[model samples]
Target chain A: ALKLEADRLFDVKNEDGDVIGHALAMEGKVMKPLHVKGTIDHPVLSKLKFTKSSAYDMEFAQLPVNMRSEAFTYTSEHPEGFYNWHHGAVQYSGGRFTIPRGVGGRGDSGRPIMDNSGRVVAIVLGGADEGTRTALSVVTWNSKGKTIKTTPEGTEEW
Target chain B: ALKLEADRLFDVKNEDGDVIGHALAMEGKVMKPLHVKGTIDHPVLSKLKFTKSSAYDMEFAQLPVNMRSEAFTYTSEHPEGFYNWHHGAVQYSGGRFTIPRGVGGRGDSGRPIMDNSGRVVAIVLGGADEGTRTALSVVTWNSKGKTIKTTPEGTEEW
Candidate 1:
């Protein structure tokens, strides 16, 4: 069985199940690679693994979650697939994150969102800090079949 | 009225109130610059400013907090004073932060610690992720007069 809470990080693969990237899913029904390719070292991510599994079922379990939806969107749209977000993690609320400070610019469009439990919850959808506590935007899931959707995790909040 | 919660960030100065760096003080009685100079831009920090003031008292208020303690320690010790800590912010427990991951080696020593309210609480004393939920170390403050003690925020905890 696919244990999301236990095996949180998933090897985001193409339709053929080839490892294209890596991701994690939290309780909010959000799932995707936590980091962009070539942006972070694997050794750092290796330490975040809760439990390693070589079983094939654990890999295929995440397929139906995004395979027919927005799973492949990140790979195709930004073939480079690098979410160079520089914002510091502030707080996670209403399914979105609020960052107070960081460097350069807000490149958090495709970066990973981690929960207090140390789980990757959501992907960036190109929102920004508006200097207010009020939540903004919403992301929906419409599972369509026979094809895949890519472009990071599709959310409409900051 | 050196209200820390009211005037969170401070202009870290020498014996004189000349701006050497900036810092914030939270409930935990911790106060120091959040970033190393030249490592980050000022505009980013300017946004984190809670309430701007041109008052002379706010500046002098923070003087006695670390003056005879360990205020100048960061400056004299590192005339090129820069705490280039690269760890991501984690939970602030028992006066220490627990970071899960970040790029490069652990350079968290001397960095500022923040609470959930976006306040810098403590300075890092060089600790690593021990992969456990236990706390470690302790930091003490003894009021000494005459000269200023320099060495970042002198703490015994991670």
Candidate 2:
């Protein structure tokens, strides 16, 4: 058996030009040959291992858990929205002289709604179109609270 | 206390220049500032405080005891003797060829000594420089024969 070590070293940064933490790709083996992709420093990923069989299974199993619940919870309860939104508006021509909401308008309440733990749980998603006094908006609620936790043995929480 | 969600799309590559896996970096931040290090396509290290204290300590504590003991044994047995050839020879010479022997070499008897399990233990530290062909090398003795196995926790056949 051929044993090889593979590792990736990353310099993590934030949007405000600050040093945060380091990301490390633990060393392992290249079962099949690998082709270099992208540029030398910031190259685009081309191909990589999808599974870690016949190698160090423990190391492979130690990978980050990509649970939708964790991702949703982390993003929803945090400072920003998880997705990039494009511009769109609902036109209510039947209404008379409604206030037109702009692209980045605060739609709802005077104060931002927060969770008991003081986390921003939702955002007002409605904006006004031209010629509207009152615009109907959608309030996006964080669904992370509904996620169930799992046990080490792979049992889901009730 | 700013939290942002970012996604990265990229190509993947295998060792032989084939595309195998596609990876997306979906990260969330809370209260902590965001830092984008290097370029977008490169392997970026993201540092975030998942909690006030890192969960790494907890993870480490959960590792199997056997795995930890194996690491310790491997380190002790391999030591400088396996890492640096020069260092190995120096240790042998400094000890005046009195070191324990290993496999592939004759011991006091023309035949190699064996452990209780009938496995060849040490070999002669041959060659002629400082301790050349001195008939001294390293060996793996029957540790079980020398040490007791009982302890407060359990019994170990050491």
Candidate 3:
């Protein structure tokens, strides 16, 4: 039997406009079969990085953006559970960009991802260039010690 | 193909509130492999008979009602043309039963079926007791000589 794990990334914000902790963003894992060599204990924790354009600014109501961050990374204990990141933004007007709404859109205005503990996880990514409303980037992350090598079809690993 | 003739009953109504006509209903005599047989010229027209309870009140507004009357005989030259008659008073409940604006209910308040000559063809047959509504009783002048037969499978002549 295969086991899959999923997580999510969230955008975080505070009342004073400071960047805070993030929530998981990804979901839908745990269906992948595991390799026989790896142990299920201490499965790798998916990681997501956040960025800001400015430091905490109560007046402007903004947080300093993180520049070192490339894109949020989500990793799974099972190799078969790996997913690729695709970055893109939504536009509403001819030259103006708008946050996407509904199930699959930008994070909530101030609070993006929410964890089981009910805490913020990540901040929404926004700001695009002319003729573009938003910009997106994708990246891959390693599973670290929690990595589990499995068959190509993910039928069996152990 | 086997040719069979059967008579179906129809309810008639008039503008004066006096129940006055009874007519026989007929359809095709045999069901062809691809098309129906028999025209309306050979229609079996039976005289409509009225019961003593068959009476209409013209004093009320001219609404249609179901009233029984003596059977009237009709003969026609055309075999595939339409034939019809009116014999009963338009029945009105005088605000007794009202249908909810949006909900579906059983009641004959408005004319539902009409012929090309703008004649009422059928009325809603109210359900018996609290059961579902019954089939509509249609009356049309059909001179197209046709017959309805029964088949071994219990299917009526089409």
Candidate 4:
């Protein structure tokens, strides 16, 4: 089950910083807050495994928890699935991730790591050292499907 | 002060599998931990304040914590003060970090990010998914100088 500790509406923009699609802040349950080894663009778990060289490269043995959602929603629900830092709106899985919200957070950090079809598989936040850590945050589209209803594991700060 | 909780000797080689510098590992002090951003390379706090882009490129943050003493001695005493993974041996300042050890660990993940002078300021471990998190382990010479011989906020291990 995916949990969202922080998921809220955010301003969407293009490379120019104009409101485009409405973006959302997604901070789900902390599977575990412990955690890259290489130059590979996407720092996803699957990609890092093959490129890590340092004995210390294995950031963790397993994910503390899966952040994806359990139930899948129709493209119309989250209409604009695409989330690009350079663009005002984002497109995902052929459909679009709905936007039109408030303003974005410290934007202009992450770049979308997409596949051959230009599909964004992972949401990599922050350029190296752009934030507190190398990857201030990463949100994947895999199990990260838990919609916008779930809560944290045990606390209720929200 | 630097709280060396885990550091060890690892393989010293160039970007390829061949062993280069006499491989050794060094781990000392566990700083507040829980941090870096992306492949910016060499995020030694000293450098980041000025050249963060380069440090963020080197992201070896997680480690096994084996701390090798002899190897550490080599790096510490290398008269030349340079230890690179490319050549069988490396040269550093006038002190040249020593060489001559067994072999190196599984070398060949990422290259040693260096300054224009070729001095290694930080230790970057992985390039991509070679690790669980993005950075398996990163050893930077920062407040690192504040050696355990020094101190922190009046506290020991939990």
Q: List fnat, each candidate.
A: 0.04, 0.00, 0.00, 0.00
| lDDT by residue for model 4 (A29-124), tens | 211111111121213332322322122211222222442332112221222122333433332323222222332234332233332222333433
lDDT of 1 at B101: 33
Segments of candidate 1 deviating more than 4 angstroms: A1-5, A15-17, A21-25, A28-111, A119-121, A124-158, B1-5, B15-17, B21-111, B124-158
DockQ-wise, the better of 1 and 2 is 1
Q: Return model 2's CA RMSD, one decimal.
A: 31.3
Judging by DockQ against the true structure, name the best candidate. 1
Question: CA lDDT of A20 in candidate 3?
Answer: 38
Q: In terms of TM-score, how similar is model 4 to the real structure?
A: 0.18
DockQ values per model: 0.03, 0.01, 0.01, 0.01
Tens-place lDDT digits, model 1, residues B29-75: 22432332312123333333332222211111233343334332221
Q: How accurate is candidate 1 locally (lDDT)?
A: 0.32
Most TM-score-accurate candidate: 1
Q: Fnat of candidate 2, please?
A: 0.00
Could you tell me the TM-score of candidate 2? 0.13
Docking class of predicted structure 3? incorrect
User: Candidate 3: how many backbone clashes?
Assistant: 71
**Candidate 3: where are CA atoms >4 Å away?**
A1-11, A16-22, A25-127, A137-139, A142-158, B1-158
Q: Quote the lDDT for B36 in model 3.
A: 14
lDDT of 3 by residue, A32-121 (tens): 111111111212321222232222210111111331132233332211110111222222122122322322333322223222122322
lDDT of 1 by residue, A1-158 (tens): 86444433444444554454444443322243233232222233333323322221111123334333323232112111111222444444333444443321223333453332332333443444354531212122223322221222432322
Interface RMSD of 3: 34.7
